[PDB]
Curated annotation (Swiss-Prot):
Modification after translation: Channel activity is modulated by phosphorylation. Phosphorylation is increased in failing heart, leading to calcium leaks and increased cytoplasmic Ca(2+) levels.
Compartments in which it is found: Sarcoplasmic reticulum membrane
Disruption phenotype: Embryonically lethal. Embryos die at about 10 dpc, due to defects in heart tube development. Cardiac myotubes display enlarged rough endoplasmic reticulum and cytoplasmic vesicles that contain high levels of Ca(2+).
Record text about domains: The calcium release channel activity resides in the C-terminal region while the remaining part of the protein resides in the cytoplasm.
Organism: Mus musculus (Mouse)
Coiled coil (residue ranges): none
Organism taxonomic ancestry: Eukaryota, Metazoa, Chordata, Craniata, Vertebrata
Sequence repeats (start-end): 1-85, 86-165
Function summary: Cytosolic calcium-activated calcium channel that mediates the release of Ca(2+) from the sarcoplasmic reticulum into the cytosol and thereby plays a key role in triggering cardiac muscle contraction. Aberrant channel activation can lead to cardiac arrhythmia. In cardiac myocytes, calcium release is triggered by increased Ca(2+) cytosolic levels due to activation of the L-type calcium channel CACNA1C. The calcium channel activity is modulated by formation of heterotetramers with RYR3. Required for cellular calcium ion homeostasis. Required for embryonic heart development.
Name of the protein described by the UniProt record: Ryanodine receptor 2
Distribution of this protein across tissues and organs: Highly expressed in heart, lung, cerebellum and brain. Detected at lower levels in adrenal gland, stomach, thymus, esophagus and ovary.
Length: 165
């Protein structure tokens, strides 16, 4: 995917999708019950990466930035063209819009599936340096129950990509 130059015409859309991925990274943790704290812990149900997008520094935003970049690059490599077409938290308000109404076509369904496959491939290639976790096998030999978690993680990308026009 990295061998494709990123068109700056949609760099703003890439950043919007990165902000959406970040606010959903906040949403799921807050649904679990996570607040905003200065300590990077997981059992203390707080996360220091739930603040405003502009308030986020270089040390916390490159994740979602590269997330959106690699999704769109994978779209370009697959071939489809891209162009022009409440629970109270501890300070942040993740609420872009109601993006869970319109029904996703089976193409974009399997295509978020392919995005999850690609991401799991990078993750497994990173994990092979460790010992012998049963997840070191590709996404096709992955257990069926868990596949939809990684599919939902990538579905919101095409959700926003359709909804924003």
């Amino acid at each position: 995917t990295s061998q494709i130059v990123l068109p700056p015409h949609l760099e703003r859309i890439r950043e919007r999708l990165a902000e959406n991925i970040h606010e959903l990274w906040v949403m799921n943790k807050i649904e679990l019950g996570w607040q905003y704290g200065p300590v990077r812990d997981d059992n203390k149900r707080q996360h220091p990466c739930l603040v405003e997008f502009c308030k986020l520094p270089e040390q916390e935003r490159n994740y979602n930035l590269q997330m959106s970049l690699e999704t769109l690059k994978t779209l370009l490599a697959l071939g489809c063209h891209v162009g022009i077409a409440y629970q109270l938290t501890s300070g942040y308000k993740p609420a872009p819009m109601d993006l869970s109404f319109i029904k996703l076509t089976p193409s974009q369904e399997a295509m978020v599936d392919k995005l999850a496959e690609n991401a799991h491939n990078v993750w497994a290639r990173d994990r092979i340096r460790q010992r012998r976790n049963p997840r070191l096998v590709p996404y096709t030999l992955l257990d069926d129950r868990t596949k939809k978690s990684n599919k939902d993680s990538l579905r919101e990308a095409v959700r926003t990509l359709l909804g924003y026009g």
